[PDB]
């Protein structure tokens with residue numbers, strides 16, 4: 609990996625996009641989609657968006673390869689569900705891990 613760690617699977621978000629075609633594609637493809645996030649530890653960092661870009665990148669990179677060779681074929685629609693919920697989870701894992709990095 610280089611220095612990345614899986615936070616774990618998303619606790620079934622019930623979140624949103626504002627685009628009903630992406631709402632549906634979440635409920636219709638979540639069985640196939642990459643539902644978990646890999647990050648570098650927050651210790652070298654101070655800000656979510658840049659870290660979170662690397663976090664969505666490493667989980668999408670590994671897990672798209674893992675799921676395509678199981679029988680999948682993601683689209684820009686699946687990427688937009690993935691990128692949203694992974695980015696939300698990456699930023700939420702940053703919040704918890706950054707609180708713990710302040711706590712000890």
Ligand SMILES: Cc1ncc(C[n+]2csc(CCO)c2C)c(N)n1
Nearest residue numbers: 620621622623624625626627631634
């Ligand atoms: C895991 C999960 N993610 C997204 C939605 C979809 N959804 C929630 S708000 C809204 C956007 C349109 O107002 C839609 C319909 C869901 N139900 N479950």
